[PDB]
Amino acid sequence: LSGLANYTNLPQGSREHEEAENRMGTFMGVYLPCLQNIFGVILFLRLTWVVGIAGIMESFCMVFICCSCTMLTAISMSAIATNGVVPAGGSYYMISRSLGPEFGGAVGLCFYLGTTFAGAMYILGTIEILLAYLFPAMAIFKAEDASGEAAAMLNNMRVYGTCVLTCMATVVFVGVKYVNKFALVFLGCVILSILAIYAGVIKSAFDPPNFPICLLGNRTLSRHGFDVCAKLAWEGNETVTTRLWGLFCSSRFLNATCDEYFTRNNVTEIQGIPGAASGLIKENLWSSYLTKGVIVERSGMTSVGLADGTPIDMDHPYVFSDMTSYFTLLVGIYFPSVTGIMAGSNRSGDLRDAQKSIPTGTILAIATTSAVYISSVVLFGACIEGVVLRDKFGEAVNGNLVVGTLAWPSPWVIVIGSFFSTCGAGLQSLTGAPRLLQAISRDGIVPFLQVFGHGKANGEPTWALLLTACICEIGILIASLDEVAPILSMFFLMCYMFVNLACAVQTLLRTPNWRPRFRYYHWTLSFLGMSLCLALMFICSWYYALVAMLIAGLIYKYIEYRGAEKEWGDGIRGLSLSAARYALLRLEEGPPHTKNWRPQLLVLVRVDQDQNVVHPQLLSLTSQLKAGKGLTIVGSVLEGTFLENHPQAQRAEESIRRLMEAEKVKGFCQVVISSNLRDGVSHLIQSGGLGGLQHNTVLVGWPRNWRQKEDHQTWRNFIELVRETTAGHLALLVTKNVSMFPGNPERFSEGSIDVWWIVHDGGMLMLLPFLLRHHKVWRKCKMRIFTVAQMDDNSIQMKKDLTTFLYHLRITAEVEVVEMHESDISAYTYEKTLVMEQRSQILKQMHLTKNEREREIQSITDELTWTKRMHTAVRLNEVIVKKSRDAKLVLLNMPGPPRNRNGDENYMEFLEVLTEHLDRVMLVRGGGREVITIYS
Amino acid sequence: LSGLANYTNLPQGSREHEEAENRMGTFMGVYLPCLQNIFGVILFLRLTWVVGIAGIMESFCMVFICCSCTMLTAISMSAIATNGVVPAGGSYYMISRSLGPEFGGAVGLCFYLGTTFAGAMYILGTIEILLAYLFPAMAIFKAEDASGEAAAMLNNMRVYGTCVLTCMATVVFVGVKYVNKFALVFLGCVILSILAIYAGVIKSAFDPPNFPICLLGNRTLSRHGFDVCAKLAWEGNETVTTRLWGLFCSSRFLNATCDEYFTRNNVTEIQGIPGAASGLIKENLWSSYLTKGVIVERSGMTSVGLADGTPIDMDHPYVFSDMTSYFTLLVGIYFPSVTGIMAGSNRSGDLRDAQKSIPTGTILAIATTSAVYISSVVLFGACIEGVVLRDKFGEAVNGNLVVGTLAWPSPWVIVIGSFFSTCGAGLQSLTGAPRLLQAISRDGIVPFLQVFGHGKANGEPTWALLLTACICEIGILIASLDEVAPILSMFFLMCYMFVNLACAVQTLLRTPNWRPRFRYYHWTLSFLGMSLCLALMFICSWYYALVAMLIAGLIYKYIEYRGAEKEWGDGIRGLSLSAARYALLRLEEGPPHTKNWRPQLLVLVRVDQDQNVVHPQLLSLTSQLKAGKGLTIVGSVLEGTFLENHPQAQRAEESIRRLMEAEKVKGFCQVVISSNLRDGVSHLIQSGGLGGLQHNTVLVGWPRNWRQKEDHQTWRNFIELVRETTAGHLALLVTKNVSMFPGNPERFSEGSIDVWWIVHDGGMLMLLPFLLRHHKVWRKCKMRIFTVAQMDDNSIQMKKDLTTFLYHLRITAEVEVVEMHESDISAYTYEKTLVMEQRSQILKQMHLTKNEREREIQSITDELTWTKRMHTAVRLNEVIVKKSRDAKLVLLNMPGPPRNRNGDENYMEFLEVLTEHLDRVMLVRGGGREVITIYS
Ligand SMILES: *[C@@H]1O[C@H](CO)[C@@H](O[C@@H]2O[C@H](CO)[C@@H](O)[C@H](O)[C@H]2NC(C)=O)[C@H](O)[C@H]1NC(C)=O
Ligand SMILES: *[C@@H]1O[C@H](CO)[C@@H](O[C@@H]2O[C@H](CO)[C@@H](O)[C@H](O)[C@H]2NC(C)=O)[C@H](O)[C@H]1NC(C)=O
Ligand SMILES: *[C@@H]1O[C@H](CO)[C@@H](O[C@@H]2O[C@H](CO)[C@@H](O)[C@H](O)[C@H]2NC(C)=O)[C@H](O)[C@H]1NC(C)=O
Ligand SMILES: *[C@@H]1O[C@H](CO)[C@@H](O[C@@H]2O[C@H](CO)[C@@H](O)[C@H](O)[C@H]2NC(C)=O)[C@H](O)[C@H]1NC(C)=O
Ligand SMILES: *[C@@H]1O[C@H](CO)[C@@H](O[C@@H]2O[C@H](CO)[C@@H](O)[C@H](O)[C@H]2NC(C)=O)[C@H](O)[C@H]1NC(C)=O
Ligand SMILES: *[C@@H]1O[C@H](CO)[C@@H](O[C@@H]2O[C@H](CO)[C@@H](O)[C@H](O)[C@H]2NC(C)=O)[C@H](O)[C@H]1NC(C)=O
Ligand SMILES: [Cl-]
Ligand SMILES: [Cl-]
Ligand SMILES: [K+]
Ligand SMILES: [K+]
């Protein structure tokens, strides 16, 4: 078709990434390289053995929790694909560009260790097929002709595993273009072998395949060694013994001295593969765990037993178990039969729509190998009987591969068909592993690896091959599948767990550039799949899971330390520099800030001619209001230029540092040399903070001695600060008589705290006495609430809503409604009428109706010129001082500033007549955009 | 003494904390309440049993790793004591005030669960002594008189454990003052019992205590049930059988039909406690692990064995094992014998020097119980033989407590002496546990617990007693020591691990208010002790350690979520708000910032009359310089007041947001409405950032069209910015021809980058071309280095140091030394001469000499008026443009600004003649306080 001349199941790596600085639909580029790294030697060498030991409903469940593991990791990888633009280079560049260089050096290094131990599991599966089924005469170590054949079997896999690994790691050094060419014969040998196996089980429902086994009375024998079973060889006229007699008795002379189990029992011959038609699921759907050295023993037979001490004599031709078996041992052997799901992203800079091919091409290439493994375990447990399943190496059927004796041609279709694919999977993983190590050490995220990025011309790793040919050597010296198999399955389960974790902590915390766009992500499938990866990590080996999880987390913190040492300059200083910046960039997203207002505060203090703070008691009121929580920035302004008044600001800086550590204030300090104090104050209200760590209110003193002279632009700077916060939508706390405010160890014995509503923000006016009584100074004071009502309304019902609001919150205050009818209150009500419904649009976008419009007053209660007739607060101040003149703290809402600046001094002498004969006052001012629904 | 009338080993709790808002030396207040909660029932009921099974050198090692665990946790608790002022209230307030409310609600809640399961381990030890040694006739359940006595033993501990727990949880509800009075009889019963046991082993070296056991030929018998052993009862004239015969044979008729092991074997009588003098350490220093149901079998005897199938008949009077035993089972039973180290901080608001009593009073009260347990295991394995150690409940010695048969009076000194102390330890822990739950729910850190802080008058918990009397019930229904014992030992190991971890991550990261002042802290002892707590957590039960560690970490994140929901207002927004603030407060400590300078940058951009950025190519030069790393703040200034020009700043804000996301800039934006641009720029240079997240350099354009007119205060604002950064010690990058600078996808094919030194900062001048070539635009350009030398020096050697500097760093540049002799260079050299040695004091406090003064040039190389004779850069510019006129980027150090402002326009036309006929120039300016030793 001339498009299949570019098949290439190999991964891209580093060379196709650097050349993208300056064709493959779904089937040929994603789906087929994924259905070629998934199918492997466990399907042809171990899946019959685990269904004979676990049975169905224990193999059926371990193929259902090992496949539902990798299905949920496949969803999390499809979110990484549909995030950015899918860079060219493979799976290392596609993950570490959407999860950061820390979650990419840890997934990227647990993956190189997984495939370099998979590459030892394929060379181990090569010599198993070459020594047990192809050529069992090349075996160079024959131990003693005794029961000590286990050690010579291991020492034969160590001299041939080394000789194959040397020749395999020198084919991919000179013949890389040839191994790329031969990638289509490997996919054919896999796909032909699976079609052969499903072929013969449809033939078996009509014609069974005729493989016979021989039982010495409920004991399975090894057919290698004798010809005909029969025990007698009747032969016609005279009878002479068989060769089966010659292995159990003293000689072939027919006289005497045979052994005891041989003499009291007969022999039998049954069909080892009794077709799919025989009702063999029933007597094969339960477990049969065995111990090392146990005869396999077909159940349901006669077997007169010796009932003696059983000197079983491990030299007779029996079939013994070679290892003890249980459920959690089988999961670590079966698990590498589902790995290979990062192969759908091998060719990511070759597709035409890589955000559509990588999702559907790996979800379908997983759901179709699940339909093979689930249907193989039912059909193997309905066509073969148990004692032929329960031995590997096929001793009951004369040295034939047990899955091979089910194919439509002779069993050499599967024996050669598995020999080449296990050779072409260890040639693949010995190229894809030293490519990924070369891709890691070019990025420089791990600085000691940096000589494993060197190559020859045209890429093609030269030193990373030498390291991979030594790590794969120590899986050859172990020399056993069922030992190398659960080791690599821990490394693959580790990297599938860090992928699932990183994609779930970023959707919750809302990291900035992360959009999955997939369709079915929902953040919990990546969390539920993480909960299955470490569950399966524990039941393979908890002493393996606990050490592969610790050094993965100990290279995560080596990326962050070395990455911050070059980003900011020094190491341990940079970890906190990087943690603050990343938390700030997370804040700027776009959704609104908060639906429960909390004063952040920005304290404006004044210093004097030798730079000491003028009123230090303003800083102790912040300590009694914040109690260490939130943000607090203190700011002072000097006059002059920076160029010659800067040492006057070095020591004005440290005098607020030394004083906010003595009044126990937790926050930051900013000292600014402006040319005048009018705009230098106005700057700090604008640029206070960094990003989302910005202030919310201003706390400033009162401009006392304003009326005299010689401070003429001090009270004109005050009224311009009231207008700058109404336009900037901040809030305002101004404290009159700052020197009368208590220090930290003074502790008012009793008394009260009065609040006056009038007709404005109560959520801001009930929260401030609430927060004050969490301090040891204001703990013992009561709290009385005075609200001013007009008339023509009711008030009688207004106080009822006030009482249940305190009942629903347990504040234990008391209310009293004072009433005006004439123009006593007009600086509050007259100038604005629409704020009642202007407040409503602030709470309509708030989107809370179910029991959240309760626990929030103001709304539950809502039920003649400044210039020289004007506003008069004498009738208002006379009713305030009649009931609050000795109350330790009064809280008032101050009225809104006038429009035209011709009434800027009629406004200041409204605030003096309002608050006369009152000792400690604190005037508040709203901003409209404050709701408080939960009172801490 | 009338000071011992205030002994009170009970903990303080919540009442003594709220009353400290408004006498006990070391021995009586720390040391003795610590030597009373440590000594317990494992010393009297299980320590003999574990030394008979493990032997010495396996009991010797598990008392050495369980005591060295709690010794290192005792050091970490002595750092918490010598940090603040040691508040009043106990151990909950002392930890959660120096480790935060998150490491205090997790240590504080794993501790309440530990003592409420210790309180079930004492009521279980009460009914064991009352049913096996005191009154073995109160047993209300007698099963079948068969081998099914294990179930009736458990059902007898469930009806008496419930009846004692009801009466114990109603003594501490009405008689709390009496239990406080009786705390001195409990310390006496403990201290008298230990003096009794060490007494009898000195008597045993001269007089053994005479306790006899009887062996049926290598089989230990149960002496309860028969009187004299002897098997015959010769009696004088006629012989009639014993009662030992009557338990093994059919009747007492002397005829026949006895059992087979009884008939072929004799009986024997040996001393069960053969003194300290017998050489019995040898035949007792090795393990003897047994299985459930095994006869104990004293080794080294004759014992003609049956060699048959052994119908052992578990109804004969034998001594059988009741459980199977191994090494990691014994650690979970032995471990609660060292807990009780938080008792030295029970009375913290009662001492006189609490920072000196709590260290020495718990270190010595741990080192002296280690001398008891280490010396008990040697002396128990030299005075008792193995088959009396290897049975609990004392069946071989006729129902006597095995540690009781070693005391100087009759063994009832230990039997009553342990009955009262285990009763006074379950009365203590049933008061200290519902006090700590009441201390937790007053703080409000866990909001659903808040009804367990309610009390009656005078404190004294009323509902927390009801919860503790139901959690302790489910340790009564388990009804077995050796089952409740490893459960509580997991909770105590959990809280000792979070204490050790929190004290090691704060010393490394340098959290602000943390000073240990102790003497021997060194941060690694708290880390090495953490490495032993979770090691011991795994070898008790890994399926218990894995679930007690998960819900401890799942209340840590419940403290942080609910604590940030009230600190900032909304929940998941506040986690990132709190993480940014805490990382910023960590930065302000006092040590200097960095010894490897990295440009942080602060870009000053200009907008126009409809608020679009004037030169957008200044923002792409930051992307090509930072590449996403570090901090970058862009700042623009408008003219006017805030009160009417603020919507002009809303949309000037979003036009830099929409443009710094398109040029791929990562950072923050600040727009400021000043009254003039001179001080509004000067403010941003001062207050740029928050805390330690502040800028380091300024990147600004060039004031083109300065010479004409109508922009007269634009170039006067420029030269004032050069002086404001020299005084403020910042650094400066000014770019000429900003529109000629390349965009992001333009990718220079080849070319060069030239740099000219002259005679100043090269660390800042080699780092900027280094960082530029990490981008795809400047990757392919070369890098030539031109340095200007004077004369009378050498230069010949200067270029040699330049070449090895690039050899030691692999930059692949080339150098060339151009030379001047006359006054060509005088704007650089003439005005300042002392900067060579002024630089030296900057690097003397740097404190780096060992190979760090290499890899840092500038120092390795150091080997006539401005006003209208002046400075002339025509001879300098003619040699620049001869060699660099087509070089894609030139870098120059600009000279220092003049002192007097009369030469402010002779300075600007020095910068125009210096940089004429050059297309892309970038002038740099130092600051003195920049060293770069590692070039990324
Ligand atoms: C049973 O064993 C005896 C050995 O004692 C066999 O006896 C000899 O067998 C050889 C075999 O060729 C003959 O040449 C001898 O003549 C036999 N000698 C005697 C004394 O019998 C005997 O043949 C064996 N039984 C059978 C049936 O072969
Ligand atoms: C071994 O096989 C033989 C078959 O020849 C069994 O012999 C038969 O046993 C049954 C049951 O006792 C008898 O009814 C038949 O008459 C026997 N057949 C002959 C030809 O004699 C023998 O029982 C089997 N052994 C065991 C232990 O089952
Ligand atoms: C194979 O034969 C043995 C006898 O040699 C069977 O074992 C006996 O099994 C029964 C089952 O109830 C027990 O009661 C006997 O005690 C066993 N006897 C001995 C000597 O162990 C065995 O069951 C057979 N195998 C299978 C799979 O059934
Ligand atoms: C051995 O057992 C026999 C029972 O068969 C005993 O014989 C009887 O024992 C009773 C016991 O008092 C006598 O009254 C009978 O007279 C005995 N009868 C006979 C026929 O002996 C016998 O006594 C037992 N052996 C001994 C030594 O007591
Ligand atoms: C049980 O104890 C008796 C002691 O009466 C042992 O009998 C002695 O055995 C030794 C060794 O055979 C002889 O030398 C003595 O003569 C025996 N003593 C008498 C009085 O006959 C008897 O051996 C012991 N049983 C076992 C199994 O050791
Ligand atoms: C108690 O006696 C038994 C015999 O009843 C001893 O067991 C034998 O131990 C030897 C040791 O080498 C073995 O060779 C035998 O096979 C054992 N016999 C049986 C029947 O098990 C046993 O050793 C004695 N106990 C101790 C602690 O020594
Ligand atoms: Cl994979
Ligand atoms: Cl403790
Ligand atoms: K497979
Ligand atoms: K103890």
Residue numbers in the entry:
A (entry chain B), B (entry chain A): 62 to 83, 96 to 936, 1006 to 1010, 1049 to 1116
Q: What did the article's authors report about this structure?
A:
The electroneutral K+-Cl− cotransporters (KCCs) play fundamental roles in trans-epithelial transport, cell volume regulation, and neuronal excitability. The neuronal-specific KCC2 (SLC12A5) and glial-expressed KCC3 (SLC12A6) are essential for normal development and function of the nervous system. Here, we present single particle cryo-electron microscopy (cryo-EM) structures of the full-length human KCC2 and KCC3 at overall resolution of 3.2 and 3.3 Å, respectively. The structures of KCC2 and KCC3 are very similar to each other.
In the cryo-EM map of KCC2, the densities for K+ and one of Cl− ions are absent. The corresponding N-terminal loop of KCC2 (residues A65-N83) is also bound in the same location with the same mode as KCC3, consist with the sequence conservation in this region. The N-terminal loop of KCC2/3 binds to the intracellular vestibule of the transporter, arresting the transporters in an inhibited state. In conclusion, we solved the cryo-EM structures of KCC2 and KCC3, which display a distinct configuration compared to NKCC1.
